[PDB]
Amino acid sequence: GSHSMRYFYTSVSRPGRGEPRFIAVGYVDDTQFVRFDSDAASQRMEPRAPWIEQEGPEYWDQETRNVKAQSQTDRVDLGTLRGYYNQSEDGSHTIQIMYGCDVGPDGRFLRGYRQDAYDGKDYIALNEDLRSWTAADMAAQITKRKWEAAHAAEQQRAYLEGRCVEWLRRYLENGKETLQRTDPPKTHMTHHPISDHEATLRCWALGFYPAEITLTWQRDGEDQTQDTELVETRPAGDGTFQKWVAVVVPSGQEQRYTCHVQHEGLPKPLTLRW
Amino acid sequence: VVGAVGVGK
Amino acid sequence: IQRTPKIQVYSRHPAENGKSNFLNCYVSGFHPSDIEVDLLKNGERIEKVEHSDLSFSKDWSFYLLYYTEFTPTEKDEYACRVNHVTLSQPKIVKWDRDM
Amino acid sequence: GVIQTPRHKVTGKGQEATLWCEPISGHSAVFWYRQTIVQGLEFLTYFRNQAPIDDSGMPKERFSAQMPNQSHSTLKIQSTQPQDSAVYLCASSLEGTVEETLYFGSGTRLTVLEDLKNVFPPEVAVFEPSEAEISHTQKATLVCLATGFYPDHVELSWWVNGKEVHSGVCTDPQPLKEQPALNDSRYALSSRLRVSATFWQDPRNHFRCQVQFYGLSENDEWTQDRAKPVTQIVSAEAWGRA
Amino acid sequence: SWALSVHEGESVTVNCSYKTSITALQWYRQKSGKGPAQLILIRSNEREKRNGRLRATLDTSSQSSSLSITATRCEDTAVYFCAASSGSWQLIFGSGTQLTVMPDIQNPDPAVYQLRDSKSSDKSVCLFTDFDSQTNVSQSKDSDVYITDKCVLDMRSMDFKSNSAVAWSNKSDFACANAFNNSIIPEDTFFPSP
């Protein structure tokens, strides 16, 4: 099916505590494979997936220098942005950068995207045409003017349409065993008495990959999304994910309710009934 | 790989 | 913009007493990134606790996963202690074996 | 553009050589390259906003590169060795990216010599045009030979009546080896100046071949009796013949 | 794969190859004596791009590029490098190729003259001049004879260009009739009688 590779950059300034802290991670559709921390002892790009280990020392050495430069690049960006918003040097601010490229079942290019944020709000983003920038506020025009004059959009588009998909396809082939396989959700249902007049019914989805999944309760075919406790999908730590959904039931109306699980690893949407 | 373009903002 | 963290406490595998398992505290939807998270066994902090690599979601909110190996019992109570700049006091979330 | 000093530097083994580079004001990157063969360059180090980014090409020892401020950059070889001789090039790009236009300096030509007694200034001689040429093609080609210099740090210029000329002047691109077998062979060079036969026939016209030799300096000390191969200029003149 | 020779006005195509997956490729030339200068930049998402007399092509699949110069001049004689930047921080330079633009000689007049030193008549040199671009000069290396390479002068005001080369030795058994041996001089090379 479809696949993607995304990188997440985080630069947090430490006024007085020292120099800005920089962290970088990269993923393959849900699976992290690289790591970098400016405060770590190694000061190197480290492996986080088994299939990236085979890359030679040349790959690690240059990728370390690539990401190290970005930390320096962000360091001056903290000072530059602090000027745009007329902020004081003692405040701690953060710069977050999100970029990646999307491929298809045939491996051909689908979409590229690059987004930058300042203090949890959108700052500037590359539009889907890979030729123009979207500025969020007044200070974002200033970066937009500088980036337009520097032909930054042309430089970024070359990576997304080019080297990004070239290495994305290389990673998938190297990790066919783990990245291209889907684990269907292992489902089960549980019963909790909340009182003598009512009870709690929870529908579980365990050990599935990828993260996209849909859990819904139905009362005789009628969705109960209003009286439903939904929890955010969570990682199990072994590369799989979890999700459970609860509903409050009358003490004798358990079998009237059904749970519907939708996941790409399952050929057909599973229906679970008491 | 890595493709963040750094142009100083 | 500061976002209050969301806290979930659970186990990697379904809990069976006497068998090895992993205890997870998944913090998500919080901003800024500076956060302190501890795992508590009967209210006492666990020494060897590892954590995931810092990352964020689409709305620029961070998420982290703290984990440690443990063997559940019928008597031991586990909970996650999280403190954040958006929290005046630390928040304690007890481990529910079915939640 | 990009300014590099010194243009040339010949020094004995064991001294300290400091290279100076002034990048174009406003540029946020500085690059250092050295070049041993006319073919591909060699990368040394690279800064952005006075902060180093990549120095994988710098030699592990004796080599040190600094950028004290945004407007200047220095490269230091602490113990000069004959294996460090090359042309060192300084380049600057704006916004610090290598996906942009790189503006290079004129470069610094550094030659480090083991035996400093091999340095010899050139011998400049001017040869007068043949009467056969004046009768056959009605032109006059003067020939200049700079014989016997080491190392290959020369700059030849043709002067008539106190003004340098470039029309008809063609200096050879690379020098020759007088004894090509030897490693420390002393070099040679040639150049030509073609003028109209009527101009050569005027006895009021002056022709001078001017060769500039970069060699020793004041610190470079000399304990021999062959004068001193100093940074000098050697010339030879020839007047017009009716 | 080291040097190219092309006459004036004709078009020149230079080729090079790179190994890393790139996002942008650039062409640089370095005139003998000065620093390298940028010619043109072509991005990986592009196939051809042109500036003035410079036309460049990029093949991502074959990892190679070509530069085409239309209406070449003597000023275009230099060494041409191609620089491949895989990211915004990495940049690798190629081996480089020597381009030599031969002048257009409309009126060849091969001749081997002899010149006398202006300080004293003891020393003498031989000058091979006014031959066309086809002729190539050979280094005989007879242990005392020295022969220089060809070098084009431009009498810009008079609109005249000519190739020239120099030979000299410091012994007897040396004459201008044999210094430039018949390998390879034109048959009608003018040999004066001193």
Side-chain angles (χ1 to χ4, degrees), chain C residues 63-90:
Chain C
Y63 65 91
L64 282 172
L65 172 68
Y66 289 69
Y67 59 98
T68 186
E69 181 177 4
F70 85 114
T71 300
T73 70
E74 299 187 357
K75 302 182 176 182
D76 288 312
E77 303 176 354
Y78 298 89
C80 186
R81 178 169 64 184
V82 172
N83 190 16
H84 188 250
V85 60
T86 58
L87 300 179
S88 55
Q89 51 173 0

PDB file of all heavy atoms in Angstrom, chain C residues 63-90:
ATOM      1  N   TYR C  63       4.857  13.920  22.408  1.00  0.00           N
ATOM      2  CA  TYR C  63       4.452  12.660  23.016  1.00  0.00           C
ATOM      3  C   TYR C  63       5.688  11.846  23.378  1.00  0.00           C
ATOM      4  O   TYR C  63       6.659  11.804  22.617  1.00  0.00           O
ATOM      5  CB  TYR C  63       3.520  11.852  22.098  1.00  0.00           C
ATOM      6  CG  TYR C  63       4.130  11.364  20.799  1.00  0.00           C
ATOM      7  CD1 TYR C  63       4.743  10.118  20.718  1.00  0.00           C
ATOM      8  CD2 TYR C  63       4.070  12.138  19.647  1.00  0.00           C
ATOM      9  CE1 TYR C  63       5.292   9.665  19.531  1.00  0.00           C
ATOM     10  CE2 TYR C  63       4.616  11.693  18.455  1.00  0.00           C
ATOM     11  CZ  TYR C  63       5.225  10.457  18.402  1.00  0.00           C
ATOM     12  OH  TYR C  63       5.770  10.013  17.219  1.00  0.00           O
ATOM     13  N   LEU C  64       5.639  11.204  24.544  1.00  0.00           N
ATOM     14  CA  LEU C  64       6.736  10.387  25.048  1.00  0.00           C
ATOM     15  C   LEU C  64       6.179   9.122  25.684  1.00  0.00           C
ATOM     16  O   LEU C  64       5.044   9.102  26.169  1.00  0.00           O
ATOM     17  CB  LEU C  64       7.586  11.148  26.076  1.00  0.00           C
ATOM     18  CG  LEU C  64       8.588  12.174  25.555  1.00  0.00           C
ATOM     19  CD1 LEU C  64       9.180  12.952  26.713  1.00  0.00           C
ATOM     20  CD2 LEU C  64       9.679  11.478  24.767  1.00  0.00           C
ATOM     21  N   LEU C  65       6.992   8.067  25.686  1.00  0.00           N
ATOM     22  CA  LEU C  65       6.622   6.788  26.282  1.00  0.00           C
ATOM     23  C   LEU C  65       7.711   6.354  27.250  1.00  0.00           C
ATOM     24  O   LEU C  65       8.847   6.100  26.834  1.00  0.00           O
ATOM     25  CB  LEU C  65       6.409   5.716  25.210  1.00  0.00           C
ATOM     26  CG  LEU C  65       6.216   4.294  25.738  1.00  0.00           C
ATOM     27  CD1 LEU C  65       4.896   4.184  26.485  1.00  0.00           C
ATOM     28  CD2 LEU C  65       6.289   3.275  24.609  1.00  0.00           C
ATOM     29  N   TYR C  66       7.365   6.254  28.531  1.00  0.00           N
ATOM     30  CA  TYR C  66       8.278   5.777  29.563  1.00  0.00           C
ATOM     31  C   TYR C  66       7.924   4.335  29.909  1.00  0.00           C
ATOM     32  O   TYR C  66       6.746   4.011  30.094  1.00  0.00           O
ATOM     33  CB  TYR C  66       8.205   6.655  30.814  1.00  0.00           C
ATOM     34  CG  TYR C  66       8.808   8.037  30.654  1.00  0.00           C
ATOM     35  CD1 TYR C  66       8.209   8.988  29.836  1.00  0.00           C
ATOM     36  CD2 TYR C  66       9.969   8.394  31.330  1.00  0.00           C
ATOM     37  CE1 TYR C  66       8.753  10.251  29.690  1.00  0.00           C
ATOM     38  CE2 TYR C  66      10.521   9.656  31.189  1.00  0.00           C
ATOM     39  CZ  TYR C  66       9.907  10.580  30.367  1.00  0.00           C
ATOM     40  OH  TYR C  66      10.446  11.837  30.221  1.00  0.00           O
ATOM     41  N   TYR C  67       8.938   3.476  29.997  1.00  0.00           N
ATOM     42  CA  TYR C  67       8.706   2.049  30.169  1.00  0.00           C
ATOM     43  C   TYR C  67       9.764   1.430  31.071  1.00  0.00           C
ATOM     44  O   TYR C  67      10.884   1.937  31.184  1.00  0.00           O
ATOM     45  CB  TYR C  67       8.691   1.318  28.817  1.00  0.00           C
ATOM     46  CG  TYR C  67       9.965   1.457  28.012  1.00  0.00           C
ATOM     47  CD1 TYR C  67      10.930   0.458  28.023  1.00  0.00           C
ATOM     48  CD2 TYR C  67      10.200   2.585  27.234  1.00  0.00           C
ATOM     49  CE1 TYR C  67      12.093   0.577  27.287  1.00  0.00           C
ATOM     50  CE2 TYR C  67      11.362   2.714  26.494  1.00  0.00           C
ATOM     51  CZ  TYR C  67      12.304   1.708  26.525  1.00  0.00           C
ATOM     52  OH  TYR C  67      13.462   1.834  25.789  1.00  0.00           O
ATOM     53  N   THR C  68       9.390   0.323  31.713  1.00  0.00           N
ATOM     54  CA  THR C  68      10.316  -0.485  32.496  1.00  0.00           C
ATOM     55  C   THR C  68       9.772  -1.905  32.571  1.00  0.00           C
ATOM     56  O   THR C  68       8.561  -2.125  32.484  1.00  0.00           O
ATOM     57  CB  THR C  68      10.525   0.080  33.908  1.00  0.00           C
ATOM     58  OG1 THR C  68      11.545  -0.673  34.577  1.00  0.00           O
ATOM     59  CG2 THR C  68       9.242  -0.007  34.716  1.00  0.00           C
ATOM     60  N   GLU C  69      10.682  -2.865  32.720  1.00  0.00           N
ATOM     61  CA  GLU C  69      10.287  -4.256  32.889  1.00  0.00           C
ATOM     62  C   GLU C  69       9.824  -4.500  34.319  1.00  0.00           C
ATOM     63  O   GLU C  69      10.406  -3.975  35.273  1.00  0.00           O
ATOM     64  CB  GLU C  69      11.446  -5.193  32.548  1.00  0.00           C
ATOM     65  CG  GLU C  69      11.096  -6.670  32.672  1.00  0.00           C
ATOM     66  CD  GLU C  69      12.237  -7.581  32.267  1.00  0.00           C
ATOM     67  OE1 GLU C  69      13.332  -7.066  31.958  1.00  0.00           O
ATOM     68  OE2 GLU C  69      12.036  -8.815  32.258  1.00  0.00           O
ATOM     69  N   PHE C  70       8.771  -5.300  34.466  1.00  0.00           N
ATOM     70  CA  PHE C  70       8.227  -5.594  35.784  1.00  0.00           C
ATOM     71  C   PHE C  70       7.426  -6.885  35.716  1.00  0.00           C
ATOM     72  O   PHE C  70       7.070  -7.364  34.637  1.00  0.00           O
ATOM     73  CB  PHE C  70       7.355  -4.443  36.299  1.00  0.00           C
ATOM     74  CG  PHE C  70       5.933  -4.492  35.815  1.00  0.00           C
ATOM     75  CD1 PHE C  70       4.893  -4.701  36.706  1.00  0.00           C
ATOM     76  CD2 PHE C  70       5.634  -4.313  34.474  1.00  0.00           C
ATOM     77  CE1 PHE C  70       3.582  -4.740  36.266  1.00  0.00           C
ATOM     78  CE2 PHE C  70       4.324  -4.353  34.030  1.00  0.00           C
ATOM     79  CZ  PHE C  70       3.299  -4.566  34.927  1.00  0.00           C
ATOM     80  N   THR C  71       7.154  -7.444  36.888  1.00  0.00           N
ATOM     81  CA  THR C  71       6.328  -8.643  37.008  1.00  0.00           C
ATOM     82  C   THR C  71       5.146  -8.339  37.917  1.00  0.00           C
ATOM     83  O   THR C  71       5.333  -8.169  39.137  1.00  0.00           O
ATOM     84  CB  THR C  71       7.140  -9.817  37.556  1.00  0.00           C
ATOM     85  OG1 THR C  71       8.233 -10.095  36.670  1.00  0.00           O
ATOM     86  CG2 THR C  71       6.267 -11.052  37.673  1.00  0.00           C
ATOM     87  N   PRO C  72       3.929  -8.252  37.386  1.00  0.00           N
ATOM     88  CA  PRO C  72       2.791  -7.843  38.214  1.00  0.00           C
ATOM     89  C   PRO C  72       2.421  -8.899  39.242  1.00  0.00           C
ATOM     90  O   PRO C  72       2.659 -10.096  39.060  1.00  0.00           O
ATOM     91  CB  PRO C  72       1.666  -7.649  37.192  1.00  0.00           C
ATOM     92  CG  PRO C  72       2.015  -8.586  36.088  1.00  0.00           C
ATOM     93  CD  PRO C  72       3.521  -8.597  36.014  1.00  0.00           C
ATOM     94  N   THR C  73       1.837  -8.432  40.342  1.00  0.00           N
ATOM     95  CA  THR C  73       1.314  -9.287  41.397  1.00  0.00           C
ATOM     96  C   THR C  73      -0.103  -8.843  41.731  1.00  0.00           C
ATOM     97  O   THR C  73      -0.595  -7.828  41.231  1.00  0.00           O
ATOM     98  CB  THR C  73       2.189  -9.242  42.659  1.00  0.00           C
ATOM     99  OG1 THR C  73       2.059  -7.960  43.285  1.00  0.00           O
ATOM    100  CG2 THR C  73       3.653  -9.488  42.315  1.00  0.00           C
ATOM    101  N   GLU C  74      -0.768  -9.622  42.588  1.00  0.00           N
ATOM    102  CA  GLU C  74      -2.097  -9.237  43.049  1.00  0.00           C
ATOM    103  C   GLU C  74      -2.052  -8.108  44.069  1.00  0.00           C
ATOM    104  O   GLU C  74      -3.055  -7.408  44.242  1.00  0.00           O
ATOM    105  CB  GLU C  74      -2.823 -10.440  43.654  1.00  0.00           C
ATOM    106  CG  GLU C  74      -3.044 -11.594  42.696  1.00  0.00           C
ATOM    107  CD  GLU C  74      -3.910 -12.683  43.296  1.00  0.00           C
ATOM    108  OE1 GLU C  74      -4.288 -12.558  44.479  1.00  0.00           O
ATOM    109  OE2 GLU C  74      -4.215 -13.663  42.583  1.00  0.00           O
ATOM    110  N   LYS C  75      -0.920  -7.916  44.744  1.00  0.00           N
ATOM    111  CA  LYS C  75      -0.804  -6.936  45.818  1.00  0.00           C
ATOM    112  C   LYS C  75      -0.175  -5.621  45.377  1.00  0.00           C
ATOM    113  O   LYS C  75      -0.586  -4.559  45.854  1.00  0.00           O
ATOM    114  CB  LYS C  75       0.010  -7.520  46.977  1.00  0.00           C
ATOM    115  CG  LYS C  75      -0.566  -8.799  47.567  1.00  0.00           C
ATOM    116  CD  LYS C  75       0.270  -9.283  48.741  1.00  0.00           C
ATOM    117  CE  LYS C  75      -0.344 -10.511  49.398  1.00  0.00           C
ATOM    118  NZ  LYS C  75       0.449 -10.965  50.574  1.00  0.00           N
ATOM    119  N   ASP C  76       0.812  -5.664  44.483  1.00  0.00           N
ATOM    120  CA  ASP C  76       1.540  -4.457  44.110  1.00  0.00           C
ATOM    121  C   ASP C  76       0.649  -3.475  43.359  1.00  0.00           C
ATOM    122  O   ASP C  76      -0.100  -3.852  42.453  1.00  0.00           O
ATOM    123  CB  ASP C  76       2.755  -4.809  43.250  1.00  0.00           C
ATOM    124  CG  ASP C  76       3.862  -5.470  44.044  1.00  0.00           C
ATOM    125  OD1 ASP C  76       4.218  -4.944  45.119  1.00  0.00           O
ATOM    126  OD2 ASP C  76       4.385  -6.508  43.586  1.00  0.00           O
ATOM    127  N   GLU C  77       0.745  -2.204  43.740  1.00  0.00           N
ATOM    128  CA  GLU C  77       0.063  -1.113  43.059  1.00  0.00           C
ATOM    129  C   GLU C  77       1.092  -0.268  42.320  1.00  0.00           C
ATOM    130  O   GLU C  77       2.102   0.137  42.905  1.00  0.00           O
ATOM    131  CB  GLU C  77      -0.714  -0.241  44.045  1.00  0.00           C
ATOM    132  CG  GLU C  77      -1.736  -0.984  44.880  1.00  0.00           C
ATOM    133  CD  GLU C  77      -2.407  -0.084  45.900  1.00  0.00           C
ATOM    134  OE1 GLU C  77      -1.995   1.090  46.020  1.00  0.00           O
ATOM    135  OE2 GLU C  77      -3.345  -0.549  46.581  1.00  0.00           O
ATOM    136  N   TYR C  78       0.831  -0.002  41.045  1.00  0.00           N
ATOM    137  CA  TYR C  78       1.709   0.817  40.226  1.00  0.00           C
ATOM    138  C   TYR C  78       0.957   2.052  39.750  1.00  0.00           C
ATOM    139  O   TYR C  78      -0.256   2.014  39.521  1.00  0.00           O
ATOM    140  CB  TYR C  78       2.243   0.032  39.024  1.00  0.00           C
ATOM    141  CG  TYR C  78       3.075  -1.178  39.392  1.00  0.00           C
ATOM    142  CD1 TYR C  78       2.484  -2.419  39.586  1.00  0.00           C
ATOM    143  CD2 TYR C  78       4.453  -1.079  39.537  1.00  0.00           C
ATOM    144  CE1 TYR C  78       3.241  -3.530  39.917  1.00  0.00           C
ATOM    145  CE2 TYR C  78       5.219  -2.183  39.867  1.00  0.00           C
ATOM    146  CZ  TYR C  78       4.608  -3.406  40.056  1.00  0.00           C
ATOM    147  OH  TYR C  78       5.365  -4.507  40.385  1.00  0.00           O
ATOM    148  N   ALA C  79       1.690   3.154  39.610  1.00  0.00           N
ATOM    149  CA  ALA C  79       1.106   4.408  39.163  1.00  0.00           C
ATOM    150  C   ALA C  79       2.184   5.249  38.495  1.00  0.00           C
ATOM    151  O   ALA C  79       3.382   5.020  38.682  1.00  0.00           O
ATOM    152  CB  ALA C  79       0.462   5.177  40.323  1.00  0.00           C
ATOM    153  N   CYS C  80       1.742   6.226  37.709  1.00  0.00           N
ATOM    154  CA  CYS C  80       2.633   7.131  36.995  1.00  0.00           C
ATOM    155  C   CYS C  80       2.483   8.538  37.556  1.00  0.00           C
ATOM    156  O   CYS C  80       1.362   9.038  37.703  1.00  0.00           O
ATOM    157  CB  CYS C  80       2.335   7.124  35.495  1.00  0.00           C
ATOM    158  SG  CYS C  80       3.487   8.088  34.487  1.00  0.00           S
ATOM    159  N   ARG C  81       3.613   9.168  37.864  1.00  0.00           N
ATOM    160  CA  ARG C  81       3.654  10.524  38.396  1.00  0.00           C
ATOM    161  C   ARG C  81       4.208  11.447  37.320  1.00  0.00           C
ATOM    162  O   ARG C  81       5.332  11.251  36.849  1.00  0.00           O
ATOM    163  CB  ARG C  81       4.513  10.581  39.659  1.00  0.00           C
ATOM    164  CG  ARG C  81       4.667  11.964  40.261  1.00  0.00           C
ATOM    165  CD  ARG C  81       5.310  11.871  41.635  1.00  0.00           C
ATOM    166  NE  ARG C  81       6.667  11.336  41.555  1.00  0.00           N
ATOM    167  CZ  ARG C  81       7.429  11.073  42.611  1.00  0.00           C
ATOM    168  NH1 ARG C  81       6.968  11.291  43.835  1.00  0.00           N
ATOM    169  NH2 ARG C  81       8.652  10.588  42.441  1.00  0.00           N
ATOM    170  N   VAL C  82       3.421  12.450  36.937  1.00  0.00           N
ATOM    171  CA  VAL C  82       3.781  13.370  35.866  1.00  0.00           C
ATOM    172  C   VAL C  82       3.662  14.795  36.388  1.00  0.00           C
ATOM    173  O   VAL C  82       2.641  15.160  36.981  1.00  0.00           O
ATOM    174  CB  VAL C  82       2.891  13.176  34.623  1.00  0.00           C
ATOM    175  CG1 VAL C  82       3.151  14.269  33.597  1.00  0.00           C
ATOM    176  CG2 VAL C  82       3.114  11.799  34.015  1.00  0.00           C
ATOM    177  N   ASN C  83       4.704  15.594  36.172  1.00  0.00           N
ATOM    178  CA  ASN C  83       4.699  17.009  36.509  1.00  0.00           C
ATOM    179  C   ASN C  83       5.037  17.822  35.268  1.00  0.00           C
ATOM    180  O   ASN C  83       5.960  17.479  34.522  1.00  0.00           O
ATOM    181  CB  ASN C  83       5.692  17.326  37.632  1.00  0.00           C
ATOM    182  CG  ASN C  83       5.531  18.737  38.172  1.00  0.00           C
ATOM    183  OD1 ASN C  83       4.517  19.396  37.935  1.00  0.00           O
ATOM    184  ND2 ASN C  83       6.535  19.209  38.902  1.00  0.00           N
ATOM    185  N   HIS C  84       4.285  18.898  35.054  1.00  0.00           N
ATOM    186  CA  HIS C  84       4.448  19.736  33.877  1.00  0.00           C
ATOM    187  C   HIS C  84       4.233  21.189  34.279  1.00  0.00           C
ATOM    188  O   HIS C  84       3.651  21.483  35.327  1.00  0.00           O
ATOM    189  CB  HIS C  84       3.474  19.323  32.764  1.00  0.00           C
ATOM    190  CG  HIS C  84       3.713  20.013  31.456  1.00  0.00           C
ATOM    191  ND1 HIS C  84       2.854  20.963  30.947  1.00  0.00           N
ATOM    192  CD2 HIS C  84       4.711  19.883  30.550  1.00  0.00           C
ATOM    193  CE1 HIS C  84       3.314  21.390  29.785  1.00  0.00           C
ATOM    194  NE2 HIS C  84       4.440  20.752  29.521  1.00  0.00           N
ATOM    195  N   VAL C  85       4.729  22.099  33.437  1.00  0.00           N
ATOM    196  CA  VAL C  85       4.582  23.526  33.712  1.00  0.00           C
ATOM    197  C   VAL C  85       3.111  23.922  33.747  1.00  0.00           C
ATOM    198  O   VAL C  85       2.727  24.858  34.461  1.00  0.00           O
ATOM    199  CB  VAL C  85       5.378  24.352  32.677  1.00  0.00           C
ATOM    200  CG1 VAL C  85       4.878  24.081  31.267  1.00  0.00           C
ATOM    201  CG2 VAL C  85       5.314  25.839  33.001  1.00  0.00           C
ATOM    202  N   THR C  86       2.263  23.213  33.000  1.00  0.00           N
ATOM    203  CA  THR C  86       0.831  23.480  33.013  1.00  0.00           C
ATOM    204  C   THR C  86       0.128  22.901  34.234  1.00  0.00           C
ATOM    205  O   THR C  86      -1.054  23.196  34.443  1.00  0.00           O
ATOM    206  CB  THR C  86       0.176  22.925  31.744  1.00  0.00           C
ATOM    207  OG1 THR C  86       0.433  21.518  31.645  1.00  0.00           O
ATOM    208  CG2 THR C  86       0.730  23.617  30.517  1.00  0.00           C
ATOM    209  N   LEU C  87       0.815  22.094  35.037  1.00  0.00           N
ATOM    210  CA  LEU C  87       0.234  21.470  36.219  1.00  0.00           C
ATOM    211  C   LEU C  87       0.778  22.159  37.463  1.00  0.00           C
ATOM    212  O   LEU C  87       1.995  22.179  37.684  1.00  0.00           O
ATOM    213  CB  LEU C  87       0.545  19.974  36.257  1.00  0.00           C
ATOM    214  CG  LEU C  87       0.037  19.137  35.081  1.00  0.00           C
ATOM    215  CD1 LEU C  87       0.433  17.677  35.252  1.00  0.00           C
ATOM    216  CD2 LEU C  87      -1.469  19.277  34.930  1.00  0.00           C
ATOM    217  N   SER C  88      -0.126  22.721  38.270  1.00  0.00           N
ATOM    218  CA  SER C  88       0.288  23.327  39.532  1.00  0.00           C
ATOM    219  C   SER C  88       0.842  22.281  40.490  1.00  0.00           C
ATOM    220  O   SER C  88       1.831  22.527  41.189  1.00  0.00           O
ATOM    221  CB  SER C  88      -0.887  24.071  40.167  1.00  0.00           C
ATOM    222  OG  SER C  88      -2.009  23.218  40.317  1.00  0.00           O
ATOM    223  N   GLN C  89       0.220  21.107  40.532  1.00  0.00           N
ATOM    224  CA  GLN C  89       0.644  20.001  41.373  1.00  0.00           C
ATOM    225  C   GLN C  89       0.842  18.758  40.520  1.00  0.00           C
ATOM    226  O   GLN C  89       0.224  18.627  39.458  1.00  0.00           O
ATOM    227  CB  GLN C  89      -0.387  19.715  42.475  1.00  0.00           C
ATOM    228  CG  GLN C  89      -1.814  19.562  41.969  1.00  0.00           C
ATOM    229  CD  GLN C  89      -2.776  19.114  43.054  1.00  0.00           C
ATOM    230  OE1 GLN C  89      -2.381  18.904  44.202  1.00  0.00           O
ATOM    231  NE2 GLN C  89      -4.046  18.966  42.695  1.00  0.00           N
ATOM    232  N   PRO C  90       1.712  17.842  40.945  1.00  0.00           N
ATOM    233  CA  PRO C  90       1.902  16.603  40.183  1.00  0.00           C
ATOM    234  C   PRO C  90       0.612  15.801  40.095  1.00  0.00           C
ATOM    235  O   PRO C  90      -0.195  15.781  41.026  1.00  0.00           O
ATOM    236  CB  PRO C  90       2.976  15.855  40.980  1.00  0.00           C
ATOM    237  CG  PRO C  90       3.694  16.918  41.739  1.00  0.00           C
ATOM    238  CD  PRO C  90       2.659  17.952  42.067  1.00  0.00           C
TER     239      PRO C  90
END
